[PDB]
């Protein structure tokens, strides 16, 4: 249901400045207007505000090297193309750069993997006999490749050279324990309920 | 069954201190963790310490660190809330809870003590 | 820092009535939120952990449901027992907040 008036420019239609008690943009027809102008761009305008954030207020496109998008931990600042109200692709980051609080790395222009793979090994699961060994699960821990055996902490004399004791710490909402459990602000895994 | 019984609470003076424990009658209670949960009267719920099985873990809250000492006993199945230099702001139903294996958040919860720090 | 809203706070409906709680988030708080039951002088009472579990010995009328910064509680049919106030509270992005509390009487 790609209803015109929603706040959210869908196909069809171009500009969605929404119903005239609350149009304040002048560069869109409002949604309650006859069905040829049906949330229409107005005539002799460039560009509306709904369409992205690279228009000016008055209806014309912003000039190029202005910027529309932030910097982010792997996305570099995007900006306007001069040619299109909405901002462009924004050129990635390069690669393995510390993303996710330092937890993981920027591959494909985004935060995946972990920082296993930043110092050419990947990333495992860690196990404690006995005590706290729910704390180990929120630990990051990475292993050779194909080599599971490999496993262990950042924090340790193995992978010293890479981390240096850094016990590392996963970001909440990152997966923990082989999946069964997620970890949490308090550093504790948890989920996979009953 | 599950059921917990909190003992204490009463008129404090401000300022000073006051202790509070929590008996759980039935579950294996080094199998779970433990949490204390507040609610002032009138207002809404509050969270404020959460403790390990074995210790090894102890946050509280930043509206009471500095001012908040539990413990707890697994062999006497006691949990202990001792709380240091009462403000006004502290005059509230203190709930005892059982912060599960992580999961079904508290599982089970007590009545409660109200705490007065009028003077 | 997460903010946690809760939408109605006052609610009076008869028996019988369709009732939906929404719990308002900051930010994409994780699904691991549990609703609470609460009525005066006793103690509050789980009513649905994660999002959309029931908890055994809860009445079968409640069902959860949302995702993102939105969660939302439906009592298929109100009745009697149900008058309370109801809280939503949230994990693993959460330092136990608890929510506002909707307050929710019966009409007669």
């Known amino acids: 249901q790609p209803i015109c008036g929603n706040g959210m420019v869908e196909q069809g239609e171009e500009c969605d400045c929404g119903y005239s008690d609350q149009c304040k943009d002048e560069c869109c027809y409002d949604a309650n207007q006859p069905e040829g102008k049906k949330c229409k761009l107005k005539p002799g305008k460039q560009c509306s505000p709904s369409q992205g954030p690279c228009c000016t207020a008055h209806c014309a496109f912003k000039s190029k090297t202005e910027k529309c998008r932030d910097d982010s931990d792997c996305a570099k600042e995007g900006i306007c193309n001069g040619i299109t109200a909405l901002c462009p692709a924004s050129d990635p980051k390069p690669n393995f750069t510390d993303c996710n609080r330092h937890t993981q790395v920027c591959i494909n222009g985004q935060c995946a993997g972990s920082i296993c793979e930043k110092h050419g090994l990947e990333e495992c699961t860690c196990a404690s006999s006995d005590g706290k060994d729910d704390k180990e699960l929120c630990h990051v821990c990475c292993m050779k490749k194909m080599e599971p055996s490999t496993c262990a902490s950042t924090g340790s004399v193995q992978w010293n050279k890479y981390f240096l004791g850094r016990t590392i710490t996963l970001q909440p909402g990152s997966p923990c324990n082989d999946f069964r459990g997620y970890c949490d602000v308090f550093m504790r895994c948890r989920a996979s309920g009953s | 069954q599950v059921q917990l019984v909190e003992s204490g609470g009463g008129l404090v003076k401000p300022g000073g201190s006051l202790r509070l424990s929590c008996a759980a009658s039935?579950?294996?209670?080094?199998?779970?963790?433990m949490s204390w949960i507040r609610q002032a009267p009138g207002k809404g719920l509050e969270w404020v310490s959460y403790?390990?099985?074995?210790?090894?873990?102890?946050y509280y809250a930043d509206s009471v660190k500095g001012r908040f000492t539990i413990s707890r006993d697994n062999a006497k199945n006691s949990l202990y809330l001792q709380m240091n230099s009462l403000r006004a702001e502290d005059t509230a139903v203190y709930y005892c809870?059982?912060?599960?294996?992580?999961?079904?958040?508290?599982?089970?919860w007590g009545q409660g003590t109200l705490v007065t720090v009028s003077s | 820092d997460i903010q946690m809203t809760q939408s109605p706070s006052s609610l009076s409906a008869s028996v019988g009535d369709r009732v939906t709680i929404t719990c308002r988030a900051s930010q994409s708080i994780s699904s691991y939120l549990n609703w609470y039951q609460q009525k005066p002088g006793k103690a509050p009472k789980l009513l649905i952990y994660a999002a959309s579990s029931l908890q055994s010995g809860v009445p079968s009328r409640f069902s959860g449901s949302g995702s993102g910064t939105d969660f939302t509680l439906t009592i298929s049919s109100l009745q009697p027992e149900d008058v309370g106030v109801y809280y939503c509270?949230?994990?693993?992005?959460?330092?136990?907040?608890f929510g506002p509390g909707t307050k929710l009487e019966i009409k007669r």
């Open positions: 039935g579950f294996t209670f080094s199998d779970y963790y």
């Open positions: 403790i390990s099985s074995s210790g090894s873990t102890i």
């Open positions: 809870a059982r912060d599960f294996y992580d999961s079904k958040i508290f599982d089970y």
């Open positions: 509270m949230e994990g693993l992005k959460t330092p136990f907040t």
